[PDB]
Design a protein around this ligand. Structure first.
Ligand SMILES: CCCCCCCC/C=C/CCCCCCCC(=O)O[C@@H](COC(=O)CCCCCCCCCCCCCCC)COP(=O)([O-])OCC[N+](C)(C)C
Ligand SMILES: CCCCCCCC/C=C/CCCCCCCC(=O)O[C@@H](COC(=O)CCCCCCCCCCCCCCC)COP(=O)([O-])OCC[N+](C)(C)C
Ligand SMILES: CCCCCCCC/C=C/CCCCCCCC(=O)O[C@@H](COC(=O)CCCCCCCCCCCCCCC)COP(=O)([O-])OCC[N+](C)(C)C
Ligand SMILES: CCCCCCCC/C=C/CCCCCCCC(=O)O[C@@H](COC(=O)CCCCCCCCCCCCCCC)COP(=O)([O-])OCC[N+](C)(C)C
Ligand SMILES: CCCCCCCC/C=C\CCCCCCCC(=O)O[C@@H](COC(=O)CCCCCCCCCCCCCCC)COP(=O)([O-])OCC[N+](C)(C)C
Ligand SMILES: CCCCCCCC/C=C\CCCCCCCC(=O)O[C@@H](COC(=O)CCCCCCCCCCCCCCC)COP(=O)([O-])OCC[N+](C)(C)C
Ligand SMILES: CCCCCCCC/C=C\CCCCCCCC(=O)O[C@@H](COC(=O)CCCCCCCCCCCCCCC)COP(=O)([O-])OCC[N+](C)(C)C
Ligand SMILES: CCCCCCCC/C=C\CCCCCCCC(=O)O[C@@H](COC(=O)CCCCCCCCCCCCCCC)COP(=O)([O-])OCC[N+](C)(C)C
Ligand SMILES: CCCCCCCC/C=C\CCCCCCCC(=O)O[C@@H](COC(=O)CCCCCCCCCCCCCCC)COP(=O)([O-])OCC[N+](C)(C)C
Ligand SMILES: CCCCCCCC/C=C\CCCCCCCC(=O)O[C@@H](COC(=O)CCCCCCCCCCCCCCC)COP(=O)([O-])OCC[N+](C)(C)C
Ligand SMILES: CCCCCCCC/C=C\CCCCCCCC(=O)O[C@@H](COC(=O)CCCCCCCCCCCCCCC)COP(=O)([O-])OCC[N+](C)(C)C
Ligand SMILES: C[C@@H]1CC[C@@]2(OC1)O[C@H]1C[C@H]3[C@@H]4CC=C5C[C@@H](OCCC(CO)CO)CC[C@]5(C)[C@H]4CC[C@]3(C)[C@H]1[C@@H]2C
Ligand SMILES: CC(C)CCC[C@@H](C)[C@H]1CC[C@H]2[C@@H]3CC=C4C[C@@H](O)CC[C@]4(C)[C@H]3CC[C@]12C
Lengths: 1105, 92
């Protein structure tokens, strides 16, 4: 059969052919009509039975000879005499209507289908999400209309209640009653909840217009939506999405839904609403505008074990306005007022024509309903009762059902309704157990229910006591929420490449992941001795700073909205933002290096930049309050984040807006100075003092207080306690600005000598100038090896890889290596010939020198890059070379397109030679630079300098050259000008940021560079090394200064959020919309008062007479 | 306090509320103990009791060590004096 439906669900065709009631209509002979008119008590004319078994009964006379002992005519049973056979129709109807087909579905099951098969039909066969709520509406059929007030509202709440809770709305479906009002409410809120509300019409296969159009095994039957006139039959309401048509009986009989629909209301409740949650799915009932068998149904749902609560919207119709008042004349759960038989049964007789023959039977159903009014919620329209029934529906499940507030809270948690819990569960006088609000916190975190975490923290959950090792372990291991698949991919890459079967994650492994992501020398609290010891042993089993540990959790689980929330709680907000930026950046990288499908490297790179911006914006806030305290924030050790600093974390994440911020640039400038006040001093007194040492004693140095915001070496901070004479020399020569000019003068003197060497004739032995040059480069080279093998990151292959990322270190490496090739050839060359330049090994050596010196003039751009104006232009030059590449490739092609024809036309008698490669490129290149070779253009002219080249075809080359220069100058050179004009500002801007950023690494370098410059640096190498055998900069703060700084951080974070709320609440767009909404509200009350004052006019009539 | 949180982070550094309460009626008297400590005091209404908690949104407290738990009458002698000694100060 290739279908679970075809093999499971059935039809109910009336095989047995009871004649109609007894009597023929007319038409004296009783053989034609006893066959023709006389339908079956099934409910159809005799030939429609089409009994595969008894098809030949009608031809004879019929099934079941007439007389049959009248008793045995009612003996027909839907149970017995009805062959259970396949479905024969299950598919997809449509509804040509309000601009959409508004598709739907039907199964057309029998009736006595088991109850479980529905749940299996609904969830896997139809692929429907199990709901968190079930609204079972009821009422009467074929009523005209409602007040235009109530009509708009009932939907607005019914929709809201169902969309916010993923609810099912069980209707009859038929567009002659309850379903109509449901559907008419759907279209007023359609294309907003058209994919969250799965309404279901459990209607019969009886009363319906075109039962035969619904037929068809696996069909897409195009069902109508026009009210077929001249009839009473009803239509399936278009705006429903699912139908369970019930094949039984016949047309007209519509009673076979209570047995099935009710079971569905019973079987959904035995399902668990969520995995983490143990409560069953709730069921509610909204009766509007009802009838007599509804009042039976209301009491049948209240009396049930457990009770299904009830909503009653007064004024919709009889049963609503009735019950709303009939359970108003009563004690809370007891007896009625002064004898109420007259007025109650009066309306029960007026609404329902009874006359005491059925007027007690309803009143007896009423007095049972009032035994439980706590479950009959009633929506008092007029006096703004519970605001758009969603509260009234949902709170009815939270009104009296002797359910603990823990269960009242979880239910809101599964619904994702905070407003309900805060206003109706966290009510005054409410009382809680000890870890009920803890278990509710564990659920809200695992479920990513961020707004409930807020509600519980406020109401008094404490994360210091809540969070524990095993709980925090669980939060990583849960598969009951929006997990991150990639966390395991990072764990298995740090463990050994493998994983055990289930592998409940450990926190030491989380610690290992963070170290891999945070990189460098980051060592996490989870991989430390004490944690590694205590965890083996698993207040001791708490955490001192739990929101640092959950921020990490939320960021490794890719739970950003929870991360942002948790970030705003606790301390060290700027640091946490920078750690989050680094975690996400490193996660984004390994996602970009994994063959998985959902790359998530722009989602993570965007989350990194979101926290990156937060750190930058907190820095600006701090800088606007106090510059000196903001600079301290960049460099204080954190002690909860591996003793790093906020600046080092930002540099780790390559976060340029933070490092290029003027606060960070102000600090870097102060560290450049050292102890020197370079506001009272001038750069020429520094240079003068490097050459005149005794002038060191007449500079304006800085006090220990002026240095309070500046990180220092341990040796440098001990000489702050006082300024004696020898301390002042220390302060000078250890300042980075001094080391710079002290190395810059030595470098300039190095180039003057090396320029002298290459320009002056070279003898066998190197001159004194050449020896000094070699000493510089040798010791300069050792100095570079020192810098590499003492950098940061432990791993050589990472130290290597970072250092060779800088342009000038690649060039310096080439410069140093090429030099000693040159010195080796120059010095190692044996002179067999007395005239130098007869010895080629010598020449190759000298020519390497003359080319190696280019590297050393270009390194002056690195020194010049220390200036704020010059440095960006140096960075621009390299960026513009990269960007202009393809314009230059096109120019190179134009050059060859001219060069090859020119040479071929003018030199037709050439043998193969490498000079051909020169000649096709040489003159065409120099043409770009203002050389037209004027007396070589027309080689056959009298003024030609190439008269022997005159020959056939040579008249073509001036035309070629004219075209060539048009293309190069008039087009390509000016395109390049236009290129540079138009990208200048964006390249200059990027280059300023890069200049400012690379200023960190430059200034930090000169704190570890020796005092002495590269010729005399060898002493600082030998001595320092030898003194180490005989045996970074930190900010030092007093305990009171740590206090005042931690308070400064907190104050400025508070200012930061206040200024945002007040900037958003004061914008015109926000004031227009609050004005918009408040004018919307008034426009109701203005009219409402308008109606009241028009009904105080009713007073004027009655009062005055 | 409930009025403070509806106007907090606007006047959180200008209003110095002071609770001159006794060292009697209070939930965790022993958690408040500790010479120069940063005692992490709770804010959950400890059920199954009548004892009261220090309202969180206050900034200063003068707890009055006397008597015992339950007796809460030793504030009128001190709090009133503060109301008398501030007035003898010159406003500016
Ligand atoms: C004694 C003498 C012996 C030796 C002498 C020879 C020594 C040779 C010396 C070579 C200099 C070595 C410098 C290399 C620097 C590498 C590090 C670095 O920053 O790289 C970066 C720059 O990209 C490069 O550096 C790529 C190479 C640049 C061109 C250098 C030679 C050009 C001149 C040759 C002319 C020959 C002309 C011939 C015909 C006349 C990496 O790239 P990026 O920055 O990520 O770029 C991204 C681009 N984007 C923005 C579009 C995305
Ligand atoms: C992180 C980056 C920076 C650091 C990178 C550092 C390492 C970079 C790499 C450096 C090495 C570069 C190559 C060295 C020369 C070999 C090539 C050559 O032609 O040699 C010649 C000289 O052969 C000699 O023996 C005389 C030279 C003395 C040694 C000077 C070079 C080594 C010093 C290194 C100082 C640097 C060390 C720095 C501190 C440790 C051999 O030829 P010939 O015999 O003359 O000619 C034969 C023909 N004949 C018949 C004409 C005679
Ligand atoms: C506004 C101002 C311009 C007015 C235009 C009027 C055009 C009138 C056309 C005149 C052509 C005739 C003149 C030359 C007489 C023929 C013989 C002769 O002397 O040949 C000479 C070369 O020249 C040639 O061999 C042919 C030149 C043809 C191209 C001329 C330009 C065509 C128009 C534009 C084309 C561009 C595309 C146009 C469409 C967009 C020989 O000179 P030689 O090199 O000294 O050779 C002798 C030495 N040898 C024996 C060693 C080889
Ligand atoms: C799509 C746009 C088209 C542009 C216009 C059409 C193109 C221009 C049309 C030019 C007219 C054609 C000239 C024919 C002359 C023949 C004479 C001769 O004997 O041979 C000559 C032709 O041979 C050459 O090689 C020279 C060709 C002229 C090249 C002009 C390039 C500049 C382009 C300008 C573009 C700007 C145009 C401005 C606007 C109009 C060479 O003479 P010779 O080798 O010395 O011969 C020996 C003679 N002797 C003994 C006396 C020394
Ligand atoms: C620039 C400011 C910045 C700071 C820089 C710091 C200092 C670092 C820089 C250099 C260190 C000092 C090196 C020079 C030592 C030798 C000098 C000399 O004359 O030698 C030579 C001495 O002998 P002579 O009498 O010339 O002998 C005749 C020639 N003969 C030797 C070939 C036979
Ligand atoms: C590593 C760091 C270095 C730092 C510098 C300090 C240490 C170095 C300082 C000085 C060393 C001088 C050694 C002199 C040796 C005596 C013989 C001699 O050369 O006589 C020459 C006189 O001298 C000159 O002509 C000067 C040549 C050097 C020019 C650069 C000096 C200025 C830069 C540095 C100072 C200012 C700093 C500027 C920056 C603010 C005459 O010429 P010749 O050479 O004999 O002729 C050779 C001809 N032949 C080969 C064909 C036979
Ligand atoms: C005579 C000499 C002849 C040729 C030498 C030409 C010099 C290199 C050419 C440029 C190559 C380049 O872009 O830089 C590389 C040269 O890295 C080195 O270490 C080069 C060392 C000299 C060999 C290094 O690349 P990088 O700068 O680390 O780029 C980062 C790449 N990343 C983005 C993938 C991390
Ligand atoms: C990484 C390390 C790489 C380099 C390793 C070391 C390489 C070492 C290389 C070469 C060593 C050569 C030793 C001698 C070989 C035998 C020949 C001989 O002795 O004499 C012959 C030398 O003739 C020449 O042409 C010599 C050219 C060699 C220099 C090439 C340097 C390349 C370095 C590039 C830069 C690299 C930069 C690297 C960094 C980026 C002839 O001499 P003669 O007797 O006078 O003959 C007179 C003839 N006459 C009659 C015509 C007048
Ligand atoms: C015995 C000898 C006696 C004489 C010794 C002394 C001689 C003189 C020595 C040296 C020459 C330079 C002196 C001028 C310095 C000006 C001061 C200044 O502000 O400097 C700046 C330059 O910072 C640098 O790093 C400049 C690097 C200089 C070397 C580059 C030379 C380029 C040559 C290639 C061209 C070929 C030319 C070749 C010519 C043949 C540093 O300041 P800043 O960082 O920009 O400040 C900005 C931040 N702020 C706004 C907060 C302030
Ligand atoms: C003897 C001859 C005269 C002497 C020469 C004069 C001295 C030499 C002149 C200028 C040198 C300028 C120094 C570099 C400045 C820093 C740039 C830098 O940091 O990285 C740049 C890379 O750089 C490149 O891609 C190329 C850099 C320029 C190489 C030019 C070589 C000269 C010949 C070339 C022509 C040969 C063709 C013609 C042949 C016919 C960055 O560019 P980016 O990728 O967009 O930005 C990323 C930056 N980031 C990674 C930091 C974020
Ligand atoms: C596509 C149109 C069709 C082509 C025809 C029309 C074109 C216009 C005009 C006319 C064409 C040129 C004719 C005049 C020259 C003839 C005389 C002569 O011999 O001249 C020379 C050779 O010349 C040749 O051998 C001719 C080569 C023509 C190549 C094609 C031209 C490009 C057309 C593209 C047009 C695109 C325009 C621009 C785009 C808008 C000189 O030879 P010689 O000195 O006598 O030889 C003696 C040698 N000896 C001493 C060794 C013995
Ligand atoms: C896309 C571009 C298309 C054009 C082009 O680049 C790519 O294609 C290349 C092919 C090259 C030639 C290949 C082989 C030889 C043979 C050799 O024979 C030694 C002779 C003698 C030396 O003195 C012995 O003593 C001499 C050189 C020569 C002719 C090449 C010349 C350059 C040419 C034309 C190049 C040209 C620039
Ligand atoms: C192919 C060989 C044999 C011939 C000579 C090659 C030419 C093109 C070489 C020789 C020396 C080279 C220069 C040496 C030093 C530098 C400084 C560096 O910061 C940029 C490249 C630059 C500017 C080189 C460009 C290319 C260069 C000029």
């Amino acid at each position: 059969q290739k279908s679970w439906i075809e093999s499971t669900l059935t039809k109910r065709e009336c095989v047995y052919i009871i004649p109609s009631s007894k009597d023929p209509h007319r038409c004296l002979p009783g053989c034609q009509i006893c066959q023709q008119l006389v339908r079956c008590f099934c409910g159809r004319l005799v030939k429609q039975h089409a009994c595969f078994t008894a098809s030949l009964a009608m031809k004879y006379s019929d099934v079941k000879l007439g007389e049959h002992f009248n008793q045995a005519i009612e003996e027909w049973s839907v149970e017995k005499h009805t062959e259970q056979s396949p479905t024969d129709a299950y598919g997809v109807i449509n509804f040509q209507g309000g601009s959409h087909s508004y598709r739907a579905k039907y199964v057309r099951l029998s009736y006595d289908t088991k109850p479980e098969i529905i749940l299996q039909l609904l969830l896997k066969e139809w692929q429907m999400e199990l709901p968190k709520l079930v609204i079972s509406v009821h009422g009467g059929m074929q009523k005209f209309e409602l007040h235009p007030r109530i009509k708009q509202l009932l939907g607005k709440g019914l929709i809201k209640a169902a969309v916010t809770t993923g609810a099912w709305i069980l209707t009859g479906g038929v567009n002659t009653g309850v379903a109509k009002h449901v559907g008419d409410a759907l279209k007023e809120h359609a294309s907003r909840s058209s994919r969250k509300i799965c309404t279901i019409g459990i209607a019969p296969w009886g009363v319906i217009e075109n039962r035969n159009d619904l037929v068809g095994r696996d069909v897409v039957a195009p069902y109508q939506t026009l009210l077929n006139p001249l009839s009473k039959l009803n239509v399936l309401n278009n705006l429903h999405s699912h139908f369970i048509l019930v094949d039984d009986g016949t047309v007209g009989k519509y009673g076979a839904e209570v047995r099935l629909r009710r079971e569905l209301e019973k079987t959904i409740n035995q399902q668990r609403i969520h995995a983490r949650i143990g409560q069953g799915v709730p069921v509610v009932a909204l009766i509007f505008e009802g009838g007599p068998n509804v009042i039976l149904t209301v009491l049948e749902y209240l009396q049930e074990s457990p009770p299904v609560p009830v909503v009653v919207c007064e004024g919709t119709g009889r049963a609503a306005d009735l019950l709303a008042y009939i359970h108003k004349q009563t004690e809370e759960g007891g007896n009625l007022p002064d004898a109420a038989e007259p007025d109650i049964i009066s309306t029960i007789k007026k609404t329902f024509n009874f006359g005491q023959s059925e007027a007690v039977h309803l009143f007896q159903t009423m007095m049972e309903c009032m035994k439980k009014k706590e479950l009959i919620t009633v929506f008092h329209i007029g006096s703004e009762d519970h605001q758009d029934i969603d509260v009234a529906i949902l709170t009815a499940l939270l009104k009296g059902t002797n359910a603990s507030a823990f269960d009242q809270l979880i239910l809101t948690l599964a619904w994702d309704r905070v407003d309900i819990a805060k206003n109706h569960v966290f009510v005054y006088g409410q009382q809680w157990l000890v870890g009920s609000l803890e278990q509710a916190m564990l659920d809200a975190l695992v479920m990513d229910r961020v707004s409930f975490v807020k509600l519980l923290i406020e109401n008094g959950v404490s994360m210091h006591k809540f969070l524990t090792i095993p709980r925090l372990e669980e939060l990583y291991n849960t598969k009951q929420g929006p997990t991150n698949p990639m966390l395991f991919h990072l764990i298995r890459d740090v463990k050994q490449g493998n994983l055990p079967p289930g592998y409940k994650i450990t926190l030491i492994d989380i610690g290992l992941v963070i170290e891999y992501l945070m990189g460098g020398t980051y060592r996490c609290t989870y991989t430390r001795k004490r944690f590694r010891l205590i965890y083996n042993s698993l207040e001791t089993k708490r955490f001192p700073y739990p929101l640092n540990e959950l921020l990490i959790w939320a960021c490794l689980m890719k739970r950003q909205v929870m991360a942002r929330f948790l970030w705003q709680h606790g301390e060290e907000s700027m640091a946490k933002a920078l750690v989050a930026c680094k975690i996400y950046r490193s996660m984004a990288y390994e996602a970009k290096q994994s063959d998985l499908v959902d790359d998530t490297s722009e989602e993570l790179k965007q989350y990194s930049n979101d926290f990156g911006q937060l750190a930058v914006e907190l820095l600006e806030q701090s800088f606007r309050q106090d510059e000196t305290m903001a600079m301290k924030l960049l460099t204080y050790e954190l002690k909860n984040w591996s003793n790093s600093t906020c600046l080092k974390l930002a540099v780790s994440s390559r976060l340029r807006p933070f490092v290029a911020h003027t606060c960070t640039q102000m600090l870097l400038s102060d560290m450049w100075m050292g102890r020197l006040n370079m506001r009272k001093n001038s750069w020429y007194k520094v240079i003068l003092s490097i050459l005149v040492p005794p002038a060191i004693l007449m500079l304006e140095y800085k006090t220990k207080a002026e240095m309070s915001h500046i990180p220092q070496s341990q040796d440098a901070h001990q000489m702050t306690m006082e300024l004696p004479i020898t301390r002042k020399f220390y302060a000078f020569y250890h300042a980075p600005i001094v080391k710079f000019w002290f190395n810059t003068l030595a470098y300039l003197g190095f180039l003057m000598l090396y320029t002298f060497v290459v320009l002056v004739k070279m003898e066998q032995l190197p001159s004194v100038q050449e020896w000094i040059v070699i000493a510089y480069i040798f010791t300069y080279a050792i100095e570079k090896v020192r810098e590499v093998f003492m950098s940061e990151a432990g791993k050589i292959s990472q130290k290597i890889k970072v250092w060779f990322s800088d342009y000038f270190n690649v060039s310096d490496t080439i410069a140093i290596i090429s030099f000693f090739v040159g010195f080796g050839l120059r010095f190692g060359a044996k002179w067999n010939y007395i005239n130098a330049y007869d010895n080629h090994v010598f020449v190759a050596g000298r020519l390497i020198y003359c080319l190696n010196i280019i590297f050393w003039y270009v390194r002056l751009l690195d020194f010049l890059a220390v200036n704020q104006q010059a440095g960006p232009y140096v960075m621009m030059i390299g960026k513009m070379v990269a960007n202009m590449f393809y314009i230059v490739v096109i120019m190179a092609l134009v050059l060859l397109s001219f060069g090859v024809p020119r040479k071929a036309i003018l030199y037709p008698h050439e043998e193969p030679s490498w000079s051909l490669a020169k000649d096709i490129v040489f003159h065409p290149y120099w043409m770009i630079f203002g050389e037209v070779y004027a007396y070589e253009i027309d080689v056959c002219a009298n003024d030609s300098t190439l008269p022997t080249i005159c020959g056939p075809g040579t008249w073509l080359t001036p035309f070629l050259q004219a075209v060539y220069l048009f293309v190069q100058y008039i087009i390509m050179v000016n395109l390049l000008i236009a290129f540079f004009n138009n990208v200048y500002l964006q390249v200059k801007a990027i280059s300023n940021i890069v200049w400012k950023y690379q200023r960190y690494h430059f200034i930090m370098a000169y704190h570890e560079k020796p005092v002495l410059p590269p010729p005399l640096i060898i002493l600082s190498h030998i001595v320092s090394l030898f003194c180490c055998v005989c045996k970074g900069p930190k900010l030092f703060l007093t305990e009171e200064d740590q206090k005042k700084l931690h308070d400064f951080e907190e104050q400025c974070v508070e200012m930061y959020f206040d200024e945002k709320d007040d900037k958003f609440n004061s914008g015109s767009e926000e004031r227009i919309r609050v004005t918009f909404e408040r004018v919307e509200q008034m426009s109701i009350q203005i009219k409402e008062v308008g109606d009241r004052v028009n009904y105080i006019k009713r007073s004027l009539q009655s009062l005055d007479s």
